[PDB]
Amino acid sequence: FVQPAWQIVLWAAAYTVIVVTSVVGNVVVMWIILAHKRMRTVTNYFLVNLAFANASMAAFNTVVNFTYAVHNEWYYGLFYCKFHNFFPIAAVFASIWSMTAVAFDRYMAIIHPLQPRLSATATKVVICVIWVLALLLAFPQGYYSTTETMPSRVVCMIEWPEHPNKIYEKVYHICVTVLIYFLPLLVIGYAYTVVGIRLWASNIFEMLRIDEDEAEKLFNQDVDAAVRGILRNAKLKPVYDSLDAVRRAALINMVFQMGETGVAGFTNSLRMLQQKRWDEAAVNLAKSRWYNQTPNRAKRVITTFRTGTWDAYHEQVSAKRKVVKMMIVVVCTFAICWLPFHIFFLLPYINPDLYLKKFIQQVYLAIMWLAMSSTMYNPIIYCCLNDRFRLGFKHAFR
Ligand SMILES: C[C@@H](O[C@H]1OCCN(Cc2nc(=O)[nH][nH]2)[C@H]1c1ccc(F)cc1)c1cc(C(F)(F)F)cc(C(F)(F)F)c1
């Protein structure tokens, strides 16, 4: 019942913001990658496909979806009725599976470096396939879309053939929802956790192999022997118990080098770590004879005590971590934007009367705004979290 003019203009402005920032932003992103030829990096080829799918959905559907929702009248005829119901499914499938292709490409480059799967022709055939499967999946929704002509208006409504309980319509809707939301997010979710652990995490075995032809060193049995010994030692047990897993590895690393007795000698530094005075302990340990004899190892161990991270046992400058952080954000943005949408359309099966009663028009206009805003965020994310992308946007200015 809430229908004031003060609100409609305020919403129309909120919706145009989407159409402009999505077209402007994604046309520039497509330009940055395609024109440079140095930028054509397989991951960026899928980002072009994602930028096209985004920009297309904003241009074709935003005006048409907003006007129908505001006036409850279909102005654009039977063809555009079929088209506005077909295109969003195809464009969302293409977007989320281009994101999955990027995730699979990173997973392959990071976890399986010896088996290459990146090829310019293959990337083109993947993008080609993604779109074929997207248009096929969207087809039944477009096929059953039609107009109904009435005395005061025209109505665009989707009508499936009459069946005892309309199973095919409900099965189709669930299948689309799984293919464009739940399933690819599970695949991307899997890929970036494994990749995330590889790029950011580490362990004592990884550590000891770096700090310590010839026979292979057996750390497995000695690490457990080193833990059993520290917990038997009165001078080392309170410190060790107080420490997080990362710092515990730094303390064990020291025991592997000097032994239980030699480590127990650093009484002051061990009390600093126990008191959680990291920088103080780091400063005192760099003054030791141990640091003098082996500065490179000691600097790595000290950094582990100072930061409480695996930073010393990973590369300093990595273009790999920059992309993975950027793409994790993009996917999390997608998952957020589409969740209320899918719940809104999933609910007519659980509680059919719950929607129609209240002022769901202001609810739907908020929910549809969120869903459609997923189309404009990606260029913004690229400028904030990537150097070469933000410099590319600056170059497109007169
Ligand atoms: C075309 C439209 O579809 C909805 O509105 C019509 C009925 N339809 C329920 C139904 N009736 C059937 O017969 N099948 N499904 C809805 C629906 C269909 C599939 C879904 F996965 C979710 C909702 C739609 C779909 C998406 C998408 F693709 F992202 F989902 C995004 C957007 C936009 F962002 F532009 F507003 C619009």
Author numbering: 25 to 226, 1001 to 1010, 1017 to 1117, 237 to 321
What do the study's own words say?
To provide static characterization of cognate ligand recognition by NK1R and modulation of ligand binding by the residue in position 2.50, we determined the crystal structures of two human NK1R variants, with aspartic acid or asparagine at the 2.50 position, bound to the antagonist aprepitant. Aprepitant (2-(R)-(1-(R)-3,5-Bis(trifluoromethyl)phenylethoxy)-3-(S)-(4-fluoro)phenyl-4-(3-oxo-1,2,4-triazol-5-yl)methylmorpholine; also known as MK-869 and L-754030; Merck & Co., West Point, Pennsylvania), is a highly selective NK1R antagonist. The crystal structure of NK1R bound to aprepitant provides a detailed static picture of how the receptor interacts with its antagonist.
The resulting NK1R–aprepitant complex structure was determined at 2.7 Å resolution. The higher resolution structure was used in the discussion below. The nitrogen atoms in the triazole group form two hydrogen bonds with Q1654.60, while the oxygen in the triazolinone group establishes another two hydrogen bonds with W184ECL2 and E1935.35. In contrast, in the structure with the E782.50N mutant, the side chain of N782.50 rotates by ~30°, eliminating the interaction between N782.50 and N3017.49 (3.5 Å). This conformational change may influence receptor signaling by disrupting interactions required for activation.
